[PDB]
Design an enzyme around this catalytic site. Structure first.
Site, PDB file in Angstrom:
ATOM      1  CB  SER C 436      42.177  37.194  32.374  1.00  0.00           C
ATOM      2  OG  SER C 436      43.467  37.230  32.564  1.00  0.00           O
ATOM      3  CE  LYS C 479      38.875  39.796  36.102  1.00  0.00           C
ATOM      4  NZ  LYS C 479      39.098  37.658  37.316  1.00  0.00           N
TER       5      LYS C 479
END
Lengths: 532, 158, 532, 139
Positions: C436, C479
């Site tokens: 990520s 996120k």
């Protein structure tokens, strides 16, 4: 046998609950059996005396004022001005929460601080305040849960837990209990007693406290608790619920000195009988503090003033030749001996390869001398003194900054391929775990490879990162009290901590000359004696 | 033996504290003199010599190899074979209300019990809860308020 | 002894089945002696008390009303209105939960999410709806089957695994039991702890639970188990048989504000017994949310509103001058003191060799700055943080992309002969499969070898395909929430997560600016202060 | 303590006649004869340093002079405590010369003359100084 009559009338004596009454009477009518074989009346006799003498239905009157307690906390050592306030906070919430929502609330006041400072005294002050009694219970080395729970009513020679001994010594149901050293229990035998402590501790599960000697579970539902500690890292997670930290920090030397005159030295001179005969001028108390103890608090000073009191009593006993016995800072050694410690740590004289990190063990802050040897080799990075790789990453990152900044600090352009490092770190696994001393290792490696001396009595703390930004650490108070007990004037800190310093109470600050920096380049500007 | 030049200084200092006593000066905070040494460097001679110099009757009652609160304390006072502890038996052997008692090798204790008898030591050895001292074979407090002690060992670690 | 007169009752006063009488005979062989220092017979009669007091033949009132469960869960933590629909349609589908039954599946109903949300309290409200009993214990801190299986019942100190102890702590024989942190264990002692959970796993394998301590097996068939984990990165594969995954993501700031208005504040006030004499504005509540706590639960708000309650209690105790103090957002440092985090992140000032990525941690996706030291050297690479190696190969892809894009940004054409790289990630040791931080580390290394500044407040994430295309990842919701709350606006997401953009309400999507990109040249034009 | 002694020595291979590398080639086997001393930690640092240098140079250590202390990575001989204990042990076993840290002249004054009146204490500050005492046979 009128021992049956004594057991019966001790049941007639003391008030007791209903099931306790029925079990005591029906176990009273099990008697007139074997005295001597399987001892069917003696173990029952001791069992009934445990079930009669232990206090039921008897209470201390309690206080409901806070200002009384604020005076009595401003009579203990110096007040401390700071963490008497927290005790006011918890006790204040305890004043309001008595209207039937007492249950399943209310942490138990873990009091964290290095050993000997005013913790047991603080329990004394509070128990004075409330017309409670007081006890102590030490929990170092407890491994049996049946040292905490009861132990089985099986034969004569069977005994209950710690806590029912202690509730049996007092004559009422509501003492205070200073559970000493709750972070030092073990479990290698049967039973992990931390679960038994969570039985004791919680204000809903205390009330059914498990007892193997007794039948009926006891009621800890009125015992005010209070609890010492030394380290939060040995404190587990299930105990960590229902605990508000009260952070007792170390002392300052002016607080130590007035602690001596107001509270230590008259108690010592009242001990050895020299009442009103010896006096000490306060420069001698400063000689005693700054040269004959290095700790946090009132143990070293108690020993040194005890020995002065005794030697004075002997010297007086062979003739009463003065009117008063005054003592300056010059003839303390006559009473106590050789110089142990240096006056300040300005008698420390800059080394070549050694940095001086501020650090804090959880039983007293200290310096560390990180010691570095740049030996010829290949480029290893050996980190002794019981270290994980967090210290190894800090050392590799400071060496990475040096690999960025060779020419700024007089080094070979290629050294990481040729020069092994051995590194000794004297106990760098201490709490505030991992690096809070990255800049320490930066100055250490800069010193050792630069071949240029690192100064002393300028001792710092903080973290680094790869480009070389000095990041803020938490808990600047404990590190500055380490710098302030160990006799250090000059501290370097990150610039990002100048928000912390303004909350520091002015005793702690105003002896100290803080040189705030923001780069590794700036501690290599101050700390080195030539600039490389 | 030859003077020792150093211990009998400290013994005179501790006794000089014991001078400044004897009123109702309640300063019962009193350390009780753990003598420490190797095997055989002259400890019991110090005990005897102090007891002679203070005109008191020395009487060892050693406590090596202990893990029970029955060497110190009584028994089931119900059958023939119930006996008091080593202390009241010693205070039967010696016969003075103010002896000197050299307890011996108190770092040789052990533990095969629920409860170290170090707490049972701690009842008599305090200056406060000595004054109510009663065994299971006893009924009434025999005081030890007048009974000066002294204690050796061999290592302070254990 | 005399205890056998009672223990002959204790087996036939407790309702015991036939194999239970068989194990009673099995112990009864070892019984009926003297207990004069008998370590086997002591644990024999102890195991006998385990056989007696653990209950039998007690089913529960276990109600099956779906809108009842819904109405109990209408008061839960905030609702969340999707995952409670998942559980409500669990109980709306399951007539199979040992009701109208086939042998098809028995899912375990796993939970993974924030550590502080009320998924535990969701389990409490579930047990309120099912009208069974509750227990919980941590499967964190488990490495052994000595905590699940009992010890080898052949000497004293053989004690059962605490599942048997917990079933002793339920007076009936079909409750609902919780386990916590199932996914934080290690294969250390007595083999796999997950092997013990495989014996517990299937609803007829736990029916025959044998131990080193039990001999004739114990019933585990009726008792509904459910887990509670919080790692969002891995799932244990031997539990994939018979499992139903129910996730819970983080929150928006204003939802946390609403939760503070609804449920948290009256509890914190009733912990200090105040009658609501203190009001805090939602301006001030949102100031508490911004400046103090950085979490996706309600732990921080719980404790800090606890602090405000207690300070207000201590101030109100010193005198009664109030009907209400509506506390505004300025005198919160009168109570909470200094606020730690900043509402402003415009102070970010583009650095040389950094980036600021969005990682996938076991508290959710969060912000983490990834630091890079480009040093002179020999073309190497080193990571720190002991990462998942998707970070390593993302670095490989980023380096190969920049080796294909050397001159177009101004890089020197050779760096794998002269430049080593050191890469710090704060927490990339996650088993987030896939980086990520692929384009994050790509941005960072392009910025670093560029020797050009790297703009902050542009939170980027995802992977890098080897063809210069930005690969998609999931878990986009938490996120984007983290980048919203931490004070970031510009986002760099792949194009191929475009339906995950649908998956969030527009409050998240009307504080931000999401850029669908798929060429890495686009974002490396976007971030640097030079346009390449 | 052993590795610290080796660290000093690796810095000082010129002075003692060792080959110009020796960390690569020599495994070291150490026998410490004692069961369990309640004194824990190195009260015998330069003991090991002398043993190691005498071994790696193959030159005999004088078994006439007793010694104690601690070491540190450049030779800075730290001080140790319990000096009355170590001197009484050094004179009960019939030895007459003791090497101590130079940080122990202030500790070498509070002792009775009964103990100091057999011994000839020779205070040193650095590990190079104990290697000036105990290494007479350099060839």
């Amino acid at each position: 046998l009128s021992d049956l009559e004594a057991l019966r009338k001790k049941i007639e004596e003391v008030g007791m609950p209903e099931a306790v009454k029925t079990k005591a009477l029906k176990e009273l009518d099990r008697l007139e059996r074997m005295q001597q074989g399987s001892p069917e009346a003696t173990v029952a006799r001791t069992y009934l005396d445990w079930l009669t003498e232990v206090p039921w239905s008897k209470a201390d009157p309690e206080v409901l004022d806070i200002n009384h307690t604020r005076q009595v906390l401003d009579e203990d050592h110096y007040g401390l001005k700071d963490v008497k306030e927290r005790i006011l906070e918890y006790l204040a919430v305890r004043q309001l929460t008595q209207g039937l929502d007492v249950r399943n609330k209310a942490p138990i006041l873990v009091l964290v601080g290095p050993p000997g400072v005013g913790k047991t005294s603080l329990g004394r002050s509070i128990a004075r305040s409330m017309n409670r009694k007081f006890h102590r219970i030490s929990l170092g080395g407890v491994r049996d849960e049946a040292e905490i729970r009861g132990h089985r009513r099986t034969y004569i020679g069977a005994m209950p837990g710690k806590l029912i001994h202690a509730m049996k010594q007092v004559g009422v149901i509501n003492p205070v209990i200073l559970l000493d050293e709750i972070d030092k229990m073990s479990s290698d035998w049967r039973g992990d007693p931390a679960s038994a402590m969570l039985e004791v501790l919680d204000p809903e599960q205390n009330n059914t406290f498990t007892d193997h000697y007794l039948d009926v579970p006891y009621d800890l539902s009125k015992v005010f608790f209070i609890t010492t500690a030394n380290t939060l890292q040995t404190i587990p997670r299930p105990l960590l619920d229902r605990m508000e930290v009260i952070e007792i920090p170390g002392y300052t030397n002016m607080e130590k000195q007035a602690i001596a005159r107001q509270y230590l030295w008259p108690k010592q001179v009242r001990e050895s009988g020299m009442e009103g005969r010896i006096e000490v001028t306060d420069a001698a108390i400063l000689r005693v503090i700054s040269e004959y103890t290095r700790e946090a608090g009132v143990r070293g000073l108690e020993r040194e003033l005890g020995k002065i009191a005794r030697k004075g009593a002997k010297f007086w006993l062979e003739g009463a030749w003065e009117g008063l016995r005054t003592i300056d800072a010059s003839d303390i050694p006559t009473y106590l001996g050789i110089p142990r410690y240096r006056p300040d740590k300005a008698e420390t004289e800059p080394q070549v390869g050694t940095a001086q990190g501020l650090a804090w063990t959880p039983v007293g802050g200290t310096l560390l001398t990180i010691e570095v040897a740049a030996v010829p080799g290949s480029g290893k990075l050996s980190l002794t003194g019981q270290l994980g790789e967090v210290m190894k990453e800090s050392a590799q990152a400071a060496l990475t900054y040096l690999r960025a900044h060779t020419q700024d600090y007089g080094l070979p352009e290629d050294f990481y391929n040729k020069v092994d490092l051995h590194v000794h770190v004297p106990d760098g696994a201490t709490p505030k775990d991992g690096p809070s001393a990255g800049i320490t290792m930066a100055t250490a490696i800069a010193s050792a490879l630069s071949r240029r001396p690192a100064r002393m009595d300028i001792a710092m703390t903080g973290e680094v990162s790869l480009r070389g930004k000095v990041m803020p650490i938490g808990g600047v108070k404990e590190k500055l009290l380490a710098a302030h007990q160990a006799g250090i004037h000059k501290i370097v800190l990150p610039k990002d901590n100048e928000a912390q310093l303004e909350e520091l109470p002015k005793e702690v600050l105003e002896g100290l000359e803080i040189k705030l920096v923001e780069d590794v380049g700036e501690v290599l500007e101050y700390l080195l004696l030539p600039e490389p």
